[PDB]
């Protein structure tokens, strides 16, 4: 679920403030997304968007509100192998996005980008 | 989900082995259940069974496989207020049983009861 995602980013990147750092970044980070990703981080985002999109293909699979089971044995995220298909899928989308964010450059010039004009 | 319930009992009762301890106890503790519960513990089990049985009123709610968000505060069990309706409901069933088990006498003679004759 969305609340669990927030925490998972914290696991992977301990000194992050997910809502402040990751939301409203590039053309894709945050609710919605269009155009071409401005950079590496943005692409991380667009791939999560698309990951969620493939999920709404599992019957009754709603990514924003589907709670799964996961753990953090520090910086390392583990998706419970016991999650149902839907929960598993979504956990993967989230885990991947978290690791992707942790390994990508962060351009301050892309934070709160003018989407109507650069997207 | 079932795997989470196992951990949920261990939390309310640290020295327990839920699967070896409560499964196949009385008339109701384990898959299925019938007759009149032989004891207090047995009564905790019937109640959990019927809690689940109700869950199947909510749309697309599968008690055995729906994973929720919860945590163990050192004995104390907390179901995340962020759970969706189906998750929250199932979390509660589970939490109430764990607490129930905590408080009920355990009768070793009620273990592996001859169901076919006593239930
Ligand atoms: C909610 C707080 C959790 C942490 C958020 C911080 C960064 C989120 C950006 C990641 C990509 C994105 O925009 N993913 C979204 C989820 C985040 C919503 C704000 C996918 O959902 P979106 O509807 O944009 O795409 C779905 C359709 O494909
Ligand atoms: C299996 C996971 C770890 C095992 C924990 C030990 C069993 C504890 C039983 C508690 C009551 C019960 O019987 N509750 C059950 C589920 C747990 C045992 C399978 C309700 O499920 P049941 O199908 O009996 O009833 C369904 C609705 O009537
Ligand atoms: Ca998005
Ligand atoms: Ca769930
Ligand atoms: Ca039962």
Curated annotation (Swiss-Prot), chains A, B:
It is found in: Secreted. Ca(2+) binds at residues 28, 30, 32, 49. A lipid is attached at residue 56 (N6-palmitoyl lysine). The active site is at residues 48, 94. One of its GO terms (molecular function) is phospholipid binding. One of its GO terms (biological process) is positive regulation of podocyte apoptotic process. Keywords: Autocatalytic cleavage, Calcium, Disulfide bond, Hydrolase, Lipid metabolism, Lipoprotein, Metal-binding, Palmitate, Phospholipid metabolism, Pyrrolidone carboxylic acid, Secreted, Signal, Zymogen. It is an enzyme of class 3 (hydrolase). Binds 1 Ca(2+) ion per subunit. It catalyses: a 1,2-diacyl-sn-glycero-3-phosphocholine + H2O = a 1-acyl-sn-glycero-3-phosphocholine + a fatty acid + H(+); 1,2-ditetradecanoyl-sn-glycero-3-phosphocholine + H2O = 2-tetradecanoyl-sn-glycero-3-phosphocholine + tetradecanoate + H(+); 1,2-dihexadecanoyl-sn-glycero-3-phosphocholine + H2O = 1-hexadecanoyl-sn-glycero-3-phosphocholine + hexadecanoate + H(+); 1-hexadecanoyl-2-(9Z-octadecenoyl)-sn-glycero-3-phosphocholine + H2O = 1-hexadecanoyl-sn-glycero-3-phosphocholine + (9Z)-octadecenoate + H(+). Disulfide bonds join 11-72, 27-119, 29-45, 44-100, 51-93, 61-86, 79-91. Its main location: secreted. GO terms for cellular component: cell surface; extracellular region. Belongs to the phospholipase A2 family. Secretory calcium-dependent phospholipase A2 that primarily targets dietary phospholipids in the intestinal tract. Hydrolyzes the ester bond of the fatty acyl group attached at sn-2 position of phospholipids (phospholipase A2 activity) with preference for phosphatidylethanolamines and phosphatidylglycerols over phosphatidylcholines. May play a role in the biosynthesis of N-acyl ethanolamines that regulate energy metabolism and inflammation in the intestinal tract. Loss of activity upon alkylation of His-48 with p-bromo phenacyl bromide; Ca(2+) and Ba(2+) protect against inactivation. This is Phospholipase A2, major isoenzyme. The gene is PLA2G1B.
């Amino acid at each position: 679920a969305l609340f669990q995602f927030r925490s998972m980013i914290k696991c992977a990147i301990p000194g992050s403030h997910p809502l402040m750092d990751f939301n409203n970044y590039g053309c894709y980070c945050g609710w919605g997304g269009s155009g071409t990703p401005v950079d590496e981080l943005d692409r991380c985002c667009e791939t999560h968007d698309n990951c969620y999109r493939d999920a709404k293909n599992l019957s009754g699979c709603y990514p924003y509100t589907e709670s799964y089971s996961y753990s953090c044995s520090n910086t390392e995220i583990t998706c419970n192998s016991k999650n149902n298909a839907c929960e598993a899928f979504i956990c993967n989308c989230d885990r991947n996005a978290a690791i992707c964010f942790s390994k990508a450059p962060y351009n301050k010039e892309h934070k709160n980008l003018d989407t109507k004009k650069y997207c």
